[model samples]
Target chain A: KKSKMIGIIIPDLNNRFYAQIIDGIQEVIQKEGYTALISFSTNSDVKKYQNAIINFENNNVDGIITSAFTIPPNFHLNTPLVMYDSANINDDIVRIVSNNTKGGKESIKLLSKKIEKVLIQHWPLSLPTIRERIEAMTAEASKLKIDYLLEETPENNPYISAQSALNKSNQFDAIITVNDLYAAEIIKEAKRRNLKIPDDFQLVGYDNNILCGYTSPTISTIDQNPKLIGQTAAHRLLDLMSGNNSTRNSIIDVLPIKRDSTEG
Target chain B: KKSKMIGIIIPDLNNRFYAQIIDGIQEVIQKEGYTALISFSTNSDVKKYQNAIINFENNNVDGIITSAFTIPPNFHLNTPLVMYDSANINDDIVRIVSNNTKGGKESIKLLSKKIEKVLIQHWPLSLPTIRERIEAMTAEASKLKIDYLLEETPENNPYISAQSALNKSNQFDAIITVNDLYAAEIIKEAKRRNLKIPDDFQLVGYDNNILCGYTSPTISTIDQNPKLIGQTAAHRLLDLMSGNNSTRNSIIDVLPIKRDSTEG
Candidate 1:
């Protein structure tokens, strides 16, 4: 007899992107007579993820689906595992991720036509997923011969980061942010600073989340097809759990949506 | 020996409101050496909630903290329970809720100065929480001699609801939406129709969530002190599990925040 339960661990639930992914995962897994034991790491703590894995193992979960976290050396796992949106390449484990290369190229290409210098505001590059996108974005921008400055959001507060970018707004024709939420912050801050988007500086963000459309000047972003990513991850986990064990990385396509924030 | 584990069940995770609540709960519970076994019902399915409760019981959790749901008659439980933001009042269980009456009155009061006719867009009224807020709002409006039209969003799609509300924009001087997210949708739709906020009509929302400040007009909203509700609930649960069962309802205060969306 099998447990018929899957363990899912994600970074946080506040981000609707993760919620949409969970919905996709549940859509496929629930119909297959399986239930999920869900957990979260509020700050992406690896220790917390490891503890959740231990708890799931204790419960004898049939499989585990999680956002990519660094697995410690010599840590053994008995349950089948699937990682979603992870850049960590492993020959033995299946990873499902969006086409960051294409998304990165599109992010710059969307702004390349009109901009002289672009400011790229990003989260920590230590994250493999972030690294993938940043690397690809730089490569494409370089190929286009576009002047760009990579600015890491060294601080935790998005408002502070937004303010920092506003300080450098005069030096750049456009700014590409970490995500739509960050872009929304910048938009709010810009309004206070009397800086108008597109008129002041064009803006682009990754992750076409709900915040994109709701902002003052709606954001231009890349749709990572999060739901499809979840569904694919769930299917891969099911396959692995059934002993199929086909270890291959899967990449879904991303779409660049041009909204009011960018000019044609 | 105690299980030293708590079980938490929430209606949904995508709502940053709920995430803040969880943060408050974790802050107190983790310090007291309790780890939560968390679960969620995406659509507030009572069946899923029931199943989660049973699972938590099976795990021998020391206590259960959940958003209030309609408890089936004669369903018995062995675990101590605390309900958060629930309208389902029972003498036996500890219920922690924000001051909905105050919130409701303040909502109408914020607009009472300017608008004679107000449109209230809301979710299902059957939810006890919604009922509390709606009743208070209607009462306040009635007392203030304000003309009002209560529109129940009969459909699932928020965009369609936004369209319906936009159609009635000419009739009302202001609109009060269910929450910040719904208000955001209306603001987005209103823009497409070339409608301006504060100039065309004042707008208000419940739950002073992050979206409130990020929107174009910066919506006016009521802050329910969600984190405090969670902390209070956790404290009550701890008391109950520790055999000090003083079962009384807790009502946290809500603050009405005025932003650019409303005329001061």
Candidate 2:
């Protein structure tokens, strides 16, 4: 007999945001000698994710960490499980996620003082988590008397999408994106166009990825801290595995980390 | 008892390149009841990595896949190890990598036929793997009689580096980059200057990342399969663990993928 194993299932690997969670999970799991069996799927079907869950079960993994929705129907497994970053699961289970609504409201309030008008380069509203940001920001932007424009950009090509919008009209005072992945590109484009950032424009994005700081006029963004989101989930899962079945639920604080992009 | 584990140590988690490898590794390891214990280090310290290795060892992981040179002195462990993309190590050990040399040579040969002069947006010469690309391309360029220039760009900020370089001078007919992290940024900067790609200048990058297809002029790149590199390493480690004792060394193939960037 050797140390027990834990499995993790993620929704999309391409997002690369999960890397922070995975890093956070590894930080704690290895300390107790539990290795991870990780899998991700593009589709949301519980049946499609069945194989990964079955394999984890076959390996007798002591526990699992997953988004709540991915758990299979007729879900009957011997292993303990922890869910993270998914909305409205059964109250009996443990779950953790960042407070996206609070994050969105706070960011918009801060931006209202810095810029009169804001443009939200957005993602699809069908994604509930992102929709929360849009909803919260919309209310706050209205209350702050800030004029805002909302437009959906195609997925995964934020750089070109932002540039395309700017090329047509570069008059916007600030641009806020659904993800920092694009905010960096937007800043790069501003520099290329010879625009003085914070003077000509300011940029903001979600997730506060480390790439934010790598840019010259660094990105001012919301720090969702997916690493902390993950580590907290891991600790809860570990606690559950230790026979403490408290059915813990947690909401991670998503805070703003101001940088040069909107320091003014 | 639960199944034994396999561990992977990468340089950083932010490089979505590892996602491909992890996906590949997971594809195989699950069938044999092996989970993964993956760790990536931010600070470049060999001894700090030693602690991670020792932790994996104490947990009785069956094997590991890692790059070269992370192993510190006084290393002695019973676990089987498979080195991937590592340059130098014990001759008796197994190792695997993408065929960067071949991919590098092929790209330059393609550029030489289409253009008289090429600008290679290279990384630091100290990194052996990328320098391998530089070396192979340099040889092929000289042989083909294509005038060439090599320039160094920082790792995290290739976009600004490329844009900054282009701002200084944009005479080169083509620019080939070491990474696709900013290939779109390069393309957009060219556009910001009202320059047409291929007609004004063509662009190429390594790692045929999914981003290659997302840009306005889809980036021309090498399809060096990181997933296959990971898969091959996983298979080799599994074989070595089974007492095959076969010291296997292999390189996955890399081929040029033509897109709008190089269609001309």
Put down candidate 1 lDDT per residue, B227-262, tens digits, no spaces. 898899999998898788787898889999998888
Best by TM-score: 1
Leading candidate by lDDT = 1
Tens digits of lDDT, candidate 2, A13-43? 4455688888788788867767666665556
Question: For model 1, what is the error of residue B232's alpha carbon versus the real structure, in angstroms, after optimal superposition?
Answer: 2.9
TM-score of chain B of 2: 0.92
Give per-model TM-scores: 0.91, 0.69
Candidate 1 chain A: 10-residue stretch with minimal lDDT:
A33-42
Give the local distance difference test score of model 1.
Answer: 0.83
List RMSD in Å for every model shown.
2.6, 7.0
- Evaluate residue A119 in candidate 2 and report its C-alpha lDDT on the 0 to 100 scale: 83
